[PDB]
Design a protein around this nucleic acid. Structure first.
Ligand SMILES: [Mg+2]
Ligand SMILES: [Mg+2]
Ligand SMILES: [Mg+2]
Ligand SMILES: [Mg+2]
Ligand SMILES: [Mg+2]
Ligand SMILES: [Mg+2]
Ligand SMILES: [Mg+2]
Ligand SMILES: [Mg+2]
Ligand SMILES: [Mg+2]
Ligand SMILES: [Mg+2]
Ligand SMILES: [Mg+2]
Ligand SMILES: [Mg+2]
Ligand SMILES: [Mg+2]
Ligand SMILES: [Mg+2]
Ligand SMILES: [Mg+2]
Ligand SMILES: [Mg+2]
Ligand SMILES: [Zn+2]
Lengths: 55, 101, 144, 143, 72, 124
RNA sequence: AGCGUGUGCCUACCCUACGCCGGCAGGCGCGGGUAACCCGUUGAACCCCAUUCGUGAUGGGGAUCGGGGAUUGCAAUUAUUCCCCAUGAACGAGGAAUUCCCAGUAAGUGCGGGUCAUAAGCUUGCGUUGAUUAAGUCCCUGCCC
RNA sequence: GGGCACCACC
């Protein structure tokens, strides 16, 4: 039936199993330290998170 | 009488050292035995990213950095006096953990 | 005036200890020593057919200097650079089945024993043998 | 260090010419299907000194080397050393040599071509076979 | 042109090595190889044999370079 | 002249179980069989067997179509007509005994071989 | 040696010591670490000391192919990656033209992070060895007064 | 007509 086929493809690994936690975009993702943000969102929220530019 | 370890973690050094000094002074005013504060190596988290939201222009990079500082204090004392001195210690930005080894 | 291992040259010490192990004749040698190369980054088999004795001597000397090493530590000790065609070179480790058999053969001679923490170390008999070999090396170096 | 009275400058082994001035370990690598590892293990199995030239060997040593090279499995040479393990047609482990290797490769290509597998078609057309990009490299040999 | 060096000594070349090499005032496997039309390995073996016999002094030994000289 | 797969003829291959055939196959096929076949491969096998049973004694079986390009050719498939999807069309392939151990997708090409034309203005 | 990472809300996927099996890729057990605590005294590579080779497209170089084995995955064919035998191409220092660089620098040599179920010929950092030349000019290029 | 720059030269 449809219930079995719909969303049946496994998504336990790969680019399709991960997305940004702010905009749900799967490209340019930052996983270090469990940030789970794309690079643009991280650059937008870095000061709020606590990353400072010293060099 | 317990061997009690206080671990202080912070992002800025001024507040961390102020809290450590307050704890040391408070403990020593009760005629207690204090060891430390012993300073652990500073941790430096780094994230290097591209500035441009697209792939156009000169390849320029932002280097964001976060620093974490850690202190240890040892006390030979009963639990009640430690909580007495700790209650004042609450400071914005400093994480204080008290353990009995 | 007692000679220890650290006093003498290490390469001559390894040569003399390998000769002593070969002359003793009680070391156990695997059957496949003549058909294997010592690591995956090597291109050929060792030039010296009596390479097992040399490797055993080197392992004993290393356990003398730094005790408690396991099979992985010996594998890292004898690892080297690997060149792979048109790609950049990288570090590569040695073969585990050679290090393990060398350690087992040295334990068969009552020169190496299991360590309490883990790994293997030297017995007092092995240390005595190594110090005697070092004394012989020093005497040979001085007399000539 | 003087040259022996009976010295073979050129040897004829397996329809191949062997240079008697090269060392025996690398002299026999002129045979197609024999490499440095296989030559060294064969010579180590024949108890032949590796410090002598190919022309210094006697006929007994040469025939012993040839016999050991033809039939490795008799002389404790492991299966993983062989270059024709587990044949498709007959399932026998062996080491294939100069002409046998040339016709064995031909039969391996013919099998793929007749069955019309993709690899056989790529071999027939003359293109790359192991999934390499062909857009920018491999131009040499093409018009 | 091609360089065809002997790999095993002949009578004439062995006589040359035994007679003229121990007077060269600078003996080196490359020098002996270039003068006697000999390969490097045979030159090294011959020089080691001459050193064993005591007909030639050794100055310095290295994996890259070995240096020999005539007797005083 | 008679077909043999690693010294084994077709009849013995048909008699063998999967465990025996694992040792005849190569590393990839052996690992695939060790990990097991799923429901879709079994359904394809069942359909092929059903189609082959109904063939007339002197005629070929009806063609069975499939999308399974990663299916391993077993000795029980020899003599069946399989249409394999290449993304656009089902190409008809008759399983020969020399196809044992290959995939189905190796026999239905997924692209048109290149015949080159005159280079355009944008080439220098 | 040095900079660093390590068991994750969804979220499945961590770093690994030691013992045994295998020749190797690997497989089994059994422990530590949420970390100046365990991997780890991070036994790195170049470098150093000996051995073999000997100007031969050669034991330089390792492309292209054949046959086997193992790991990640739901799935490896149009070869994911890795290992073993075998095969052994051009290449003998590169025309016109053109790039970067002034001291622990250029270059050589490895090691971390990102990507990452599988994973570096890229990038971003880190050490190790370590120079020739110059302390000038507006000739070329370009920008300003 | 001057000044500067190993993304210029020497
Ligand atoms: Mg090493
Ligand atoms: Mg290389
Ligand atoms: Mg050959
Ligand atoms: Mg490809
Ligand atoms: Mg091409
Ligand atoms: Mg060559
Ligand atoms: Mg070569
Ligand atoms: Mg294959
Ligand atoms: Mg394609
Ligand atoms: Mg090879
Ligand atoms: Mg320019
Ligand atoms: Mg790098
Ligand atoms: Mg990586
Ligand atoms: Mg990239
Ligand atoms: Mg100007
Ligand atoms: Mg210039
Ligand atoms: Zn985002």
């Amino acid at each position: 039936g449809h219930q079995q086929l719909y969303w049946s493809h496994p998504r336990k690994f790969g680019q399709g199993s991960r997305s940004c936690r702010v905009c749900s975009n799967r490209h340019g993702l930052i996983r270090k330290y469990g940030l789970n943000m794309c690079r643009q969102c991280f650059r937008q929220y870095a000061k709020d998170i606590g990353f400072i530019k010293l060099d | 009488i317990h061997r009690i370890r206080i671990t202080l973690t912070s992002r800025n050094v001024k507040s961390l050292e102020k809290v450590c000094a307050d704890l040391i002074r408070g403990a020593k005013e009760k005629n207690l035995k204090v060891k430390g504060p012993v300073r652990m190596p500073t941790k430096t988290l780094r994230i290097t990213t591209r500035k441009t939201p697209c792939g156009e222009g000169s390849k320029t990079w932002d280097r964001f950095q976060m620093r974490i500082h850690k202190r240890l204090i040892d006390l030979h004392s009963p639990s009640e006096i430690v909580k007495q001195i700790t209650s004042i210690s609450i400071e914005p930005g400093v994480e204080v953990e008290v353990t009995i080894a | 005036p007692g000679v220890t291992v650290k006093d003498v040259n290490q390469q001559e010490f390894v040569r003399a200890l390998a000769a002593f192990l070969k002359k003793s004749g009680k070391l156990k040698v695997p059957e496949w020593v003549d058909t294997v190369k010592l690591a995956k980054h090597k291109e050929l088999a060792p030039y010296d057919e009596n390479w097992f004795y040399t490797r055993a001597a080197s392992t004993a000397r290393h356990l003398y200097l730094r005790g408690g090493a396991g099979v992985g530590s010996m594998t890292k000790i004898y690892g080297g650079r690997q060149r792979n065609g048109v790609m950049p070179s990288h570090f590569s480790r040695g073969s585990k089945s050679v290090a393990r058999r060398v350690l087992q053969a040295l334990e068969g001679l009552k020169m190496v024993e299991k360590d309490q923490d883990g790994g293997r170390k030297l017995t007092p008999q092995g240390q005595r043998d190594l110090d005697r070999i070092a004394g012989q090396v020093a005497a040979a170096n001085k007399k000539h | 260090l003087v040259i022996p009275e009976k010295f073979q400058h050129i040897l004829r082994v397996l329809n191949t010419n062997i240079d008697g001035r090269r060392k025996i370990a690398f002299a026999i690598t002129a045979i197609k299907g024999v490499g440095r590892r296989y030559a060294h293990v064969v010579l180590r199995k024949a108890d032949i000194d590796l410090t002598k030239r190919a022309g210094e060997l006697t006929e007994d040593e040469v025939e012993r080397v040839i016999t050991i090279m033809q039939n490795p499995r008799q002389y404790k040479i492991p299966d993983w050393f062989l270059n024709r393990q587990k044949d498709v047609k007959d399932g026998k482990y062996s080491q294939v040599l100069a002409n046998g290797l040339d016709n064995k490769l031909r039969e391996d290509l013919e099998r793929l071509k007749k069955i019309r597998a993709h690899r056989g078609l790529r071999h027939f057309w003359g293109l790359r076979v192991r999934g390499q990009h062909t857009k920018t490299t491999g131009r040499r040999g093409r018009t | 042109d091609k360089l065809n060096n002997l790999v095993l000594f002949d009578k004439a070349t062995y006589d040359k090595l035994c007679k003229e090499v121990p007077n060269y005032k600078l003996i080196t496997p490359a020098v002996v190889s270039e003068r006697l039309k000999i390969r490097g390995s045979l030159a090294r073996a011959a020089l080691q044999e001459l050193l064993s016999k005591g007909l030639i002094k050794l100055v310095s030994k290295h994996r890259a370079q070995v240096i020999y000289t005539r007797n005083t | 002249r008679k077909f043999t797969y690693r010294g084994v003829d077709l009849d013995q291959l048909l008699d063998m179980s999967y465990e025996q055939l694992m040792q005849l196959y190569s590393a990839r096929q052996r690992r695939r069989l060790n990990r097991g076949l799923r429901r879709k491969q079994h359904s394809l096998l069942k359909r092929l067997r059903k189609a082959k049973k109904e063939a007339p004694p002197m005629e070929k079986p009806e063609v069975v179509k499939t999308h399974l390009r990663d299916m391993i050719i077993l000795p029980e498939m020899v003599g069946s007509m399989v249409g394999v999807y290449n993304g656009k069309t089902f190409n008809q392939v008759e399983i020969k005994p020399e196809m044992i151990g290959h995939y189905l997708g190796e026999f239905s090409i997924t692209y048109k071989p290149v015949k080159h034309g005159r280079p355009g203005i944008g080439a220098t």
